[PDB]
Design a protein around this ligand. Structure first.
Ligand SMILES: Nc1ncnc2c1ncn2[C@@H]1O[C@H](COP(=O)(O)OP(=O)(O)O)[C@@H](O)[C@H]1O
Ligand SMILES: Nc1ncnc2c1ncn2[C@@H]1O[C@H](COP(=O)(O)OP(=O)(O)O)[C@@H](O)[C@H]1O
Ligand SMILES: [Mg+2]
Ligand SMILES: [Mg+2]
Lengths: 72, 525, 46, 156, 52, 75, 151
């Protein structure tokens, strides 16, 4: 969405996260010149992320368990 | 008042008309749609189109050629019909430049729409465009460079032009091999412009790189039952006689006798006449005999008893190509053997291509006729390869006829635009604006070329414009990386004929479309 | 209400199945009507 | 280098995805007719003609596919039949798998021109590997010819 | 390093197949790979569909 | 996704359908086997009547649609 | 894969969606059509329009006001609806400017169409327009003159 190359940018950010211990490195969507989200003050609620992951997993499991359709 | 908006109606049912604004709107919409469709297939990084036919056959066609794309589309907009006919005529005149001329015409008409919206009379636009066309043509003619005198330089130019033509097409994967193939095939014509002397044979299966130019000639015909399948130092006689129940051309003749013995005698006389004709043919001292028409069983066995190959049903193109490649004379009478030239070649045999058998002529005497075997993975690939090879052969033949060359990669377009802008900077009135729009379209052409590659087209075009204004007349787009480079050094060249034809045809079609202010359609059948 | 020049796309390709589903029945009806009209009107009128 | 060039159309992406989906559907169709444990397919054309076959080229050409990518796959099977004579199912399966991989490659943001050149490089390397793994054979060896014929007939 | 390791259906597992006499000529795999790669490359250079 | 103009049956469905067709053909003539078997009287929808016990005649006179059943008829 | 351009059908009968280029094309076409319609009634030499109702009343009403012109027209293009509501809100807030705001929005969207054709991300256009609007508003405020003291 920001025009950057997805695979290259994501791989670079992941490599930076692995190299230096910093789980706050993200995608510089606004091109502020840094990847650290603490200085950029991009903050999300933990409850929101946990709910996202949980709901997605449960819905994916439910969809995966369906094997027949009987529409009229 | 107008015919459409009048209290009384003057038209048949189903027939209408479009006044100034409406006709201009429809014409511009059609032209812009055609240009947008044909583009995105322009330049080295252009893509291809799928032409899915809606008929009962439902022919499937994958192509990059703009002319073929515009031919096989149901077109209702009359201006789109004008542009399609332009593309077809451009293809007829030269093998390349169809997409370029179509896009140039579309961009010119878009600029014309903008100027009309800016309250400018179309005649002023037409006059400015005529002046701009004259200036651009003069600049392009002054920019042309010729290398016909130097043989090695001309050969290098031919290779460069073939590579440039094949860069956009599907053959860009094996551009080097296909460029060598096309250049050799064109050079074997010995200056003759008959592209029909070059036969393209498409055989399914095998890689695209398996395509080759045969050193001799290949024929897709058969041989008689009891005739040799391989001869050496062949003396070939090419003929165009019937030799199939050959009847005396007196149509009113008939056989009327009183007994069956006389009928048998007449039948024996007919067989004896055919035998005498075969003997007269054999008196030429030949090894292989090629007839344009059919050969029936009696002459077939007569040839077989003499150990003479009898290739039958070789069409007019077949016999013409055989005469070109072997030097023989197509003969229809055999009373003067000393006055008939016999074609000669080192060896005739049968080769196994795919699952088919073809007659191979090797060590031909003249060789002014080529056969190219195309191998591919799909029928669409073979058809597109044939079309691309045809484009390359046409452009190379045109270059052989006229050796003047111009640099590609947008260099010629930017030079024309610079000349047009220089002319417009010293002209008063709205004609200056019209010429500026002309130059804008000319610059839009390489802009679309750069767009097709995902490059920073605006920056590249600005750099090219600055370079051409400074004095670098050979600067052009370098498509390897996305910068500007010297087209002369990088070896991107085009035929001056192709560029001149593109410019003039685009200007002509834009002028004729812009002149229209009323489209009147009769009731459809 | 502009942009009439479209040249469409694979959209009709995506609906070839239903197009042919209806077209086969339409062609059968046309054949039946053609065989019916070979006599009707062609001879009933005169 | 910044934002980069914006993609106005999004139509080429849809065309590529549709072509890949058609090819993958064709491969999954002729996926169960592979190997000695594969099973034959039964095809009934517009007329009353009935064909029971395991040959990939015959299966593909017998049934009308109506989709462009599927038609190139049918032509591919025909060409493989012309050149080699068998493996008409394996080539189609390979093409379908390659395009299925191209789906994720394109989704990752890779232009469908780097993919083509990289696939050409991979094809050349794989040809080298297959040639390295191969073993010479002579027509005077009846056992190898019998083994090849038996292997060809194992799946019919 | 087992270059000839393949799927064995007679024993329902993995084993050497040269002892199972399962071989095919090289110009089957080579041809299939070349043709499939060419077709994929041709398809990848397509971005529009036009109805005639 | 296949976009094939037709109907496709795969797996246990087609196998069961073929077995059903074969069993139906068998049951047509199963009552005319052995000395305690009895004949059948066929009508050709134009008034033609054929009384027979031969299996080949019965299977040729009948018109069959399923191809797996045509296999048994021609067998 | 698009929502509509997939072998699986995900919509009810009559529902449809338009992707990026198609949605931009329809929005720009509708906005430019509305702008061209409302314009030519602008400035001292503007002309009036005739609004013939197609209903039972068949009410006739000639007018020059942009808001009234945009109100009494059957509009199906959603972007045209956006501009019509813009003009209505402008009329509600202040008495004038109904035609000017619509013309300005149409011209801005035409320029946006050109910029998109020049391969420019719409977010960049939006940011540039926000900065330009801030600068223009500051200049207009600085240019204002007040005469509320002298009667
Ligand atoms: N290698 C290249 N580098 C730069 N420009 C090229 C190259 N090859 C072709 N072009 C340009 O692409 C344009 C379109 O050529 P092409 O698409 O092959 O045929 P057509 O002229 O019918 O569109 C030409 O004007 C040419 O200048
Ligand atoms: N006895 C066997 N054991 C293991 N694999 C086999 C055996 N016979 C054939 N195969 C493999 O099955 C694959 C599929 O072959 P087949 O089903 O005949 O279709 P195709 O020849 O079109 O690939 C071949 O690549 C071959 O390697
Ligand atoms: Mg070209
Ligand atoms: Mg096999």
């Amino acid at each position: 969405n920001s025009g950057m190359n997805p695979i290259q940018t994501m791989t670079e950010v992941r490599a930076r996260q692995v190299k230096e211990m910093n789980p706050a490195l993200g995608i510089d969507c606004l091109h502020k010149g840094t990847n650290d989200m603490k200085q950029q003050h991009v903050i999300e609620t933990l409850i929101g992320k946990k709910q996202q992951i949980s709901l997605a997993t449960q819905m994916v499991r439910m969809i995966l368990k369906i094997d027949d359709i009987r529409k009229p | 008042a107008s015919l459409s908006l009048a209290p009384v109606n003057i038209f048949k049912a189903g027939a209408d008309e479009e006044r100034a604004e409406t006709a201009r709107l429809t014409s511009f919409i059609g032209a812009i749609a055609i240009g947008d469709l044909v583009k995105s297939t322009l330049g080295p990084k252009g893509m291809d189109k799928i032409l899915l036919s809606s008929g009962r056959d439902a022919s499937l066609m994958v192509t990059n050629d703009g002319a073929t794309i515009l031919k096989n589309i149901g077109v209702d907009n009359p201006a789109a019909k004008v542009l399609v006919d332009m593309s077809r005529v451009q293809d007829d005149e030269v093998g390349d430049g169809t997409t370029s001329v179509t896009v140039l015409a579309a961009e010119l008409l878009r600029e014309a729409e903008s100027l009309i919206a800016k309250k400018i009379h179309p005649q002023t636009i037409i006059a400015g465009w005529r002046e701009a066309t004259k200036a651009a043509r003069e600049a392009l003619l002054s920019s042309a460079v010729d290398h016909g005198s130097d043989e090695v330089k001309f050969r290098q130019d031919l290779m460069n032009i073939a590579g440039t033509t094949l860069s956009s097409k599907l053959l860009t994967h094996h551009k080097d091999h296909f460029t060598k193939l096309a250049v050799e095939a064109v050079l074997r014509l010995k200056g003759s412009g008959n592209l029909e002397a070059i036969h393209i044979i498409k055989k399914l299966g095998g890689s695209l790189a398996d395509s080759y130019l045969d050193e001799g000639f290949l024929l897709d015909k058969k041989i008689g039952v009891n005739q040799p399948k391989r001869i050496e130092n062949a003396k070939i006689l090419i003929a165009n006689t019937g030799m199939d129940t050959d009847k005396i051309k007196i149509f009113g003749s008939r056989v009327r006798v009183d007994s069956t013995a006389k009928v048998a005698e007449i039948e024996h006389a007919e067989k004896e006449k055919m035998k005498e004709k075969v003997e007269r043919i054999l008196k030429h001292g030949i090894n292989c005999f090629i007839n344009r028409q059919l050969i029936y069983n009696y002459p077939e066995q007569l040839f077989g008893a003499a150990g003479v190959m009898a290739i039958e049903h070789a069409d007019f193109a077949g016999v013409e190509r055989l005469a070109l490649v072997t030097g023989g004379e197509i003969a229809s009478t055999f009373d003067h053997p000393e006055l008939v030239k016999l074609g000669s070649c080192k060896l005739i045999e049968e080769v196994m291509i795919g699952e088919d058998k073809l007659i191979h002529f090797s060590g031909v005497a003249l060789g002014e006729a080529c056969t190219i075997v195309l191998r591919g993975a799909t029928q669409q690939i073979l058809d597109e390869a044939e079309r691309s090879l045809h484009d390359a052969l046409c452009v190379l033949a045109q270059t052989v006829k006229d050796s003047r060359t111009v640099y590609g990669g947008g260099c010629s377009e930017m030079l024309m635009a610079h000349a047009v802008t220089q002319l417009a900077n010293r002209t008063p009135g709205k004609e200056a604006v019209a010429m500026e729009s002309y130059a804008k379209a000319l610059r839009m052409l390489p802009t679309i070329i750069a767009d097709n590659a995902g490059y920073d087209s605006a920056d590249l075009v600005a750099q090219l414009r600055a370079a051409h204004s400074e004095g670098n007349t050979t600067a052009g787009l370098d498509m390897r990386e996305g910068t500007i480079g010297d087209m002369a050094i990088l070896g991107i060249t085009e035929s001056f004929q192709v560029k001149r034809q593109v410019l003039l045809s685009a200007a002509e079609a834009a002028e004729v479309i812009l002149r229209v202010d009323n489209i009147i359609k009769a009731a459809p059948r | 209400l502009a942009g009439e020049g479209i040249s469409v796309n694979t959209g009709p390709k995506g609906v070839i199945n239903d197009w042919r589903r209806f077209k086969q029945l339409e062609t059968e009806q046309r054949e039946e009507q053609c065989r019916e009209m070979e006599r009707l009107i062609k001879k009933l009128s005169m | 280098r910044g934002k980069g060039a914006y993609q106005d159309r999004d139509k080429p992406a849809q065309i590529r995805f549709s072509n890949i989906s058609a090819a993958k559907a064709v491969a999954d169709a002729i996926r169960t007719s592979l190997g000695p444990k594969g099973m034959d397919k039964m095809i009934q054309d517009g007329k009353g003609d009935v064909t029971i076959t395991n040959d990939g080229a015959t299966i593909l050409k017998q049934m009308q596919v109506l989709h462009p990518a599927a038609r190139m796959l049918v032509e591919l099977s025909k060409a493989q039949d012309i050149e080699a004579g068998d493996g008409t199912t394996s080539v189609v399966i390979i093409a379908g798998s390659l395009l299925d991989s191209c789906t994720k490659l394109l989704q990752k943001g890779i232009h469908p021109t780097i993919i083509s050149e990289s696939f050409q490089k991979a094809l050349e390397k794989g040809i080298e590997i297959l040639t390295d793994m191969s073993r010479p054979v002579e027509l005077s060896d009846r056992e190898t010819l019998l083994n090849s014929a038996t292997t060809s007939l194992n799946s019919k | 390093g087992e270059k000839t390791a393949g799927i064995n259906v007679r024993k329902g597992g993995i084993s050497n197949i040269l002892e199972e006499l399962v071989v095919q000529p090289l110009l089957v795999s080579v041809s299939a790979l070349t043709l499939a790669t060419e077709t994929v490359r041709s398809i990848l250079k397509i971005d529009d569909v036009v109805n005639t | 996704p296949l976009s094939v103009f037709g109907d496709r049956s795969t797996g246990e469905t087609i196998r069961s359908q073929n077995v059903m067709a074969a069993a139906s053909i068998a049951n047509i003539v199963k009552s005319s086997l052995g000395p305690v078997g009895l004949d059948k009287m066929l009508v050709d929808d134009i008034g033609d009547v054929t009384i027979t016990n031969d299996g080949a005649t019965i299977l040729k006179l009948l018109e069959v649609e399923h191809p797996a059943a045509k296999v048994l008829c021609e067998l």
